[PDB]
């Protein structure tokens, strides 16, 4: 049995989101919906077409008729952003358990938020191990896109820079980290170092100096 889901749906906040689940005469079947927020385990949000599990907000409403099952989310919040999977058990199939491909819900038009930046210098314990690492932590920003630039005493550096991809925080903002390893010989060498984070046409810079 084949379950056809749109790969993505977008809504402005407060609007109603409709995630559809295509199938042939799917109305003759029990459809169940799962929600998977980024980094988290899935949870049951609908079972047997329209039954609400304990603790699932009345905003979520399952329905099934004809060739399409639908998960309707009214008054959509930023926290509802997730992958939504429809699911069926079709007894007459070598593959009795079927999952839908999944639909990514994205909430467009969220409030802009400036990044908070924290730069830690190489620790007193790491330097005795002849290793040196600058930790730059970026949090509370939206949209979840930032460029990071490292400077060594007003001199840009590309070597040894390892930056992560932005991840979603519980407060629906984003976080990301950037690392720069050095030699203690390189660290104590310069007068300072700078992590430079650009977000949405603006830059925040933090500086650290050895002592």
């Amino acid at each position: 049995y084949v379950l056809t889901q749109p790969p993505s749906v977008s809504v402005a906040p407060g609007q109603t989101a409709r995630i559809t689940c295509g199938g042939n005469n799917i109305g003759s079947k029990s459809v169940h919906w799962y929600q998977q927020k980024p980094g988290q385990a899935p949870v049951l949000v609908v079972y047997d077409d329209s039954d609400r599990p304990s603790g699932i907000p009345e905003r979520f409403s399952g329905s099934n008729s004809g060739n399409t099952a639908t998960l309707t989310i009214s008054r959509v919040e930023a926290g509802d952003e997730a992958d939504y999977y429809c699911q069926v058990w079709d007894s007459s199939s070598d593959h009795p358990w079927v999952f839908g491909g999944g639909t990514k819900l994205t909430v467009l038009g969220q409030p802009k938020a400036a990044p908070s930046v924290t730069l830690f210098p190489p620790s007193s314990e790491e330097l005795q191990a002849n290793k040196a690492t600058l930790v730059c932590l970026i949090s509370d920003f939206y949209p979840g896109a930032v460029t990071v630039a490292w400077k060594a005493d007003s001199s840009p550096v590309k070597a040894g820079v390892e930056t992560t991809t932005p991840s979603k925080q519980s407060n629906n903002k984003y976080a990301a980290s950037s690392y720069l390893s050095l030699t203690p010989e390189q660290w104590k060498s310069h007068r300072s170092y700078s992590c430079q984070v650009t977000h949405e046409g603006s830059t925040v810079e933090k500086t650290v100096a050895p002592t």
Partner: protein, 227 residues
């Protein structure tokens, strides 16, 4: 308050057998079905199989040859075994409680009815990595001279594979704690740092201890952080 807890190795060499176990708490395995599910990085969900508490099994055919699910009611766990492991078996593996429903839509004696299954209670998941490579140095990130709010943390470098979990003060300190997602080094190793924002006022006479747990190596490390 039924909970399901997956225990995994985190790492398994290519072509040897992956073993998983799911422990259920605040509930009984009895009278229920029990499923294993997995999710490859960036991919959808794939059901592996179920097991009735009595022993009856059922499997995704695409994996039936290599997979074995068993149950143990005497300990309230059920287990997964995946043989001849390959790189495509890299995924997060979930254990989930499975319900059997039935829709009687006509006369129950004319077979005007059918059964179905769904999963109402899920576990937290466990990351399985398939690599030939083998299997964490924690350094203090000390507070320094943010408006009455002070940031300190722990840097966890050069571990493999995912994951590591960090608590502060044995789980008593939970506010302001923000454990960042790990970086994938060019070296291939993993590195994360966890940070807690505490009041700058009376930062002294306060102890801050990050507790790092790396299950794939059975290591539980404590590190004190002070200016």
């Amino acid at each position: 308050q039924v909970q399901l807890q997956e225990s995994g190795p985190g790492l398994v060499k290519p072509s040897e057998t992956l073993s998983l176990t799911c422990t259920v708490s605040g509930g009984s395995i009895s009278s229920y079905y029990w499923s294993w599910i997995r999710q490859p990085p960036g991919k959808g969900l794939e059901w592996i199989g179920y097991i009735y508490y009595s022993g009856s099994t059922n499997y995704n055919p695409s994996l039936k040859s290599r997979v074995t699910i068993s149950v143990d009611t005497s300990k309230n766990q059920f287990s997964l075994k995946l043989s001849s492991v390959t790189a495509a078996d890299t995924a997060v593996y979930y254990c989930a409680r499975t319900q059997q429903g039935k829709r009687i839509y006509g006369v129950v004696s004319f077979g005007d009815y059918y059964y179905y299954y769904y999963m109402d209670v899920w576990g937290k998941g466990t990351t399985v990595t398939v690599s030939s490579a083998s299997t964490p140095s924690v350094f203090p990130l000390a507070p320094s001279s943010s408006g009455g709010t002070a940031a300190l943390g722990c840097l966890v470098k050069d571990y493999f594979p995912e994951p590591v979990t960090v608590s502060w003060n044995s789980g008593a300190l939970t506010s302001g704690v923000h454990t960042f997602p790990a970086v994938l080094q060019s070296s291939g190793l993993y590195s994360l740092s966890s940070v807690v924002t505490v009041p700058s006022s009376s930062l002294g006479t306060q102890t801050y201890i990050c507790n790092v747990n790396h299950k794939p190596s059975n290591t539980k490390v404590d590190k004190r952080v002070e200016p």
